[PDB]
Symmetry: C2
Subunit: 146 residues, 2 copies
């Protein structure tokens, strides 16, 4: 239904959790280099840089990049997901650069609700939250017993 | 709006992630002993056993225990959450015992959708998924800018 992309991921254990998460919801995982670690992987694709990631997507049919950012008023539930959507996340401590975020329509910028004075989410929990909202809107197509 | 409870949690790093997660959605965290590790914590309460956990809840107004289990046809989106609900999770590798699950109405037993042949979810990702679905149904009451 959709894919997950990590921009320059930093913490290997998080990328480990996100690989398992991708198997549970049927997503393939895109890692945009450079990684903060050295690197089952049958659903994992590495891209040299953001532009190479875009060049790879153009050849593979319909897509939209939804960027996880605090720099928006729209939450992950307000977006309307479609087959081919890609859920993009920056490093846990830095988020995505402005040149990536500003390349996207305002409606493809999504923030996860949070209480005032809370710490950032663990990246893998943020992926799980957005991935399961996309999958909900797509009727959990592919789920066991469904 | 709601609280999270871990039955005999095993892996400390997961409990760490779930503490941060609880701060993001405004939940308090209940740990039902024994823990698999020795143990900010201002929102964390330890209970000697399941019955002590129930004795603590009875004195603190309206509640329902929703148990995360594969032993149900109903998914986390089919449940209708209310203020006072408690989201209960067993250890990642064992899940909850039958004597806990069977004490609950069938509508308080929830499973997260998953692809056939996927590994179990990391516990903290399963908590994030159910916690953010409850919070969605409760209008993300308390969220920044909301």
């Amino acid at each position: 239904m959709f894919d997950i992309a990590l921009y320059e991921p930093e913490i290997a254990p998080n990328t480990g959790n996100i690989i398992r998460l991708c198997a549970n919801c049927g997503a393939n995982l895109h890692l945009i280099e450079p990684l903060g670690f050295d690197l089952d992987l049958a659903r994992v694709t590495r891209h040299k840089n953001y532009q190479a990631f875009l060049d790879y997507l153009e050849q593979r049919g319909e897509y939209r990049i939804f960027a996880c950012t605090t720099k928006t008023t729209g939450h992950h539930v307000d977006a309307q997901y479609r087959q081919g959507d890609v859920l993009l996340f920056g490093p846990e401590t830095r988020g995505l650069p402005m040149e990536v975020i500003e390349s996207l329509p305002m409606s493809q910028r999504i923030r996860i609700p949070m209480m005032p004075d809370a710490r950032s989410l663990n990246l893998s929990n943020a992926v799980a939250i957005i991935a399961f909202e996309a999958w909900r809107q797509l009727g959990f197509q592919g789920a066991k017993g469904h």
